[model samples]
Target: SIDNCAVGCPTGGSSNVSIVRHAYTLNNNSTTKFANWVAYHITKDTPASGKTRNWKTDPALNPADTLAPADYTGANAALKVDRGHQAPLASLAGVSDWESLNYLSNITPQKSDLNQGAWARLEDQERKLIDRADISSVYTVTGPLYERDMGKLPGTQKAHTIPSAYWKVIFINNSPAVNHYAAFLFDQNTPKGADFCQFRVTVDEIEKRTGLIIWAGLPDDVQASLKSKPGVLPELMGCK
Candidate 1:
């Protein structure tokens, strides 16, 4: 419904079709055949699950503007990229709309090492933090950074843009009115053993690179204090 769990809806280049699912809201860049961003809310009550993986084209979008899972067939084998989720499946598992996370609109051509390794580690930390006593909920906005032509998916008649890197911004709501922020940028080739915290960056940097406005609804004063610096939750999140 109103881009739930988002501090503010993003504003940037490219045309986007906003779609709301049970657990997350995403802006599908029909031209790119990938979401510009996916925003979701997670709480201590939201549990994790390993249900069947059923990747589908988003029914809300025109089939011509979305990729079918079949379009991504053998991509990992040919390109070393996995179909990565912007709204991670584990984060939405407990919700009835969890399957929406598997929609091709929310999936990206992500590097295998980053998707299965460092990026996933951060996803785990987001869930882990929510379950802690001091934390109440987690709000996340993540998407791709197409700094250059990373190339296209092999063996596909459709042209799908493979992102060169990715960015994720996490807001830790320890209380109803207070929020702590952390942002990260990971190159597609980030080492499998890399530390997620080492990739930490300021929310300002994310906006600069992606050309999307983040937390625009927040007061100028609040944004001033938070956007300029990287957050310090890595230690608590088990990152050294």
Candidate 2:
């Protein structure tokens, strides 16, 4: 399926594997190629505070049961990599939530430089906003971004594209004032401790890159307002 449709449309989110129902969703770009994107909702009460659990991969496709789920083959280059969770395990603590995050389809191979560096900081900052800001709930849509195209992993059979960058769409989700939103189109080379605030963007720009409208559930006006916003809400480090 083409990886260029709005989520929940006939060709996008609805075409995804609903791992956690309302909690998380996984859309595969192509079996053995890459995942489309992962969408999930989070709140302060998601029970995702520091519960370390062992994560594992899904079994390769059994032709009889191949459709939404295609177990990822963990084989990769010897380079340092982080199985970046599109459906972050730290965002929820529901039953089987941790297990779901571990699914190969739920992860994309990421450079440790970015994953453990600025990106991890960004992920934590997202969780932190729940406590430090006036946020009620937060919804995140995350996936790999092929900048100017990319190459497949070493020794991998499928024609997978190694992302030159990763992207995220964070909806403030019922904020105190205007619902602030932030979209980051970050490169794999993002430096550690890079100020997350310095990279904020509008939803429209991100859509220009990922080829999908984030949070299509919102009204046209509301979505437009959110997209018009320059940076995060005032509660967070907003645009200078």
Candidate 3:
């Protein structure tokens, strides 16, 4: 069922536009699926609240617009990418509206089997981590990188979804600068399912994949914080 939350730009844009956050919850009706999912919307700019930067889009239930199979045309072409969430709408309840849930930045290509299987499990585990940590300021950004020779999907279709060869990079920032953790999700690509979709990487691996330089040499202030008692904020991974 579609959630009845007002849809609008959380952050006022140049023009009044309604954006889709793509928020989803675990399908309780399905016994097989362990975690429910939702998509969050974010912009390059951070809002005054220091939370998520809001934009505009609509949340339509149509297959062409929603999480239906049509959005994943490239997936049919044998792309190994999974649709990942950026804001993790599942984490937000009454705090945020459902319309604020769907955003393009929130969606990324990821491993299909992994997303449905281990990746989903990982998200569940992360939720527990949030509860145990009792933290709310944590932020996460998850996306897919096109590796190998899997040329870009055809531009004919606007929504051509695909799976990532290997999931890469998990960034977590806890506190201002305390304990931080980072990991890369890799697909060993072995005959045994054990090595198919696995996270085997370091912070450096993430830099290579996203090319964002998350912790590249760091600035003087950042370095000083890292040496502080907390030492670089605690980084935790999340799915919702």
Candidate 4:
């Protein structure tokens, strides 16, 4: 559907039900008992640019929205997994959205290796990337990647699907002149290397794996090009 920019419902493009929030949008998937995806725009005026706050959880989702605190019970202590934020709070730090980043809807079970390793590194590098490039804005769609054997959380019975991987499509430097984007994937247990340039994949390959067509609304100019290189892009590392 990335080839077509179609919105049959009032919620804006293609989706089940869209819960629009102040800093971003949450596409709720009640069947899965988690957010299907979280999309938001990052700009200079965003709140994270100045003062900041800490991470906390609130069961009350966008009002009528989401999961339970117990849904994330084991990730921190019992299962040896990390309660990964599908949409990281640090990335949303600039914005004063009021517990929007902490909702259980954004939580997912991630392997400690990836959560504390390179994957987290890339997240920290986000603001730096934006600042260094003098980028006016960027857009990100972050979500979990699921398959048959995803397994279950430690505390929940019959509750399956602890995602082993994640993908993020970061649309950088959007404009009438830019067609650049970078896609990445982190195995729940990713490898050691430079700040996660190791997990890079092309948008095309990611779509094939995730079955989610990214960037339908961006004109051809803002479209992402193929940069499926396996290691880090030196440019992205502020290397060159």
Candidate with maximal TM-score: 1
lDDT digits (tens) for residues 115-161 of candidate 4? 78887787766656666546656567777666646566666653455
- Model 3, position 111: C-alpha lDDT score: 48
TM-score of each: 0.93, 0.75, 0.49, 0.76
- What does candidate 2's lDDT look like per residue over 33-77, in tens digits? 455677766766764656664544444423322222232344234
**Clash pairs of candidate 1?**
none
Model 1 per-residue lDDT tens digits across residues 1-240: 445655676767366547777778787776778888878888766657777778998888889888998888788887899888898888777887777878888898898899999999999998888878878778888989878887777756875677889998888773112666788999999999988889989888989888888766776777777788778766677767
Rank candidates by lDDT, best first.
Answer: 1, 2, 4, 3
Of candidate 1, the 10-residue stretch with the lowest lDDT total is 172-181
TM-score of 4: 0.76
- lDDT (10s digit) by residue, model 3, range 1-240: 332121211121111222333343211101111111221222222221224534332233223433433344665356555444434445543244543443433454454555566555555444444454444333333434435544344422443333233342222333223435434454423222333224545544544554433332345576344422221121334311
Per-residue error at 136 for model 3, in Å?
Answer: 4.6
| CA displacement after TM-score superposition, residue 150 of candidate 3 (Å) | 3.6
Error of 1 at 78 (Å): 1.8
Cα RMSD, model 4: 5.3
User: Candidate 2 vs candidate 3: which has greater TM-score?
Assistant: 2
Whole-model Cα lDDT of every candidate shown, in order: 0.80, 0.59, 0.36, 0.58
RMSD of 3: 11.7
Q: What local lDDT score does residue 33 receive in model 1, on the 0 to 100 scale? A: 84
- Model 3 — which ten-residue stretch has the worst lDDT? 26-35
lDDT of 2 at 76: 36
lDDT pick, better of 2 and 4: 2
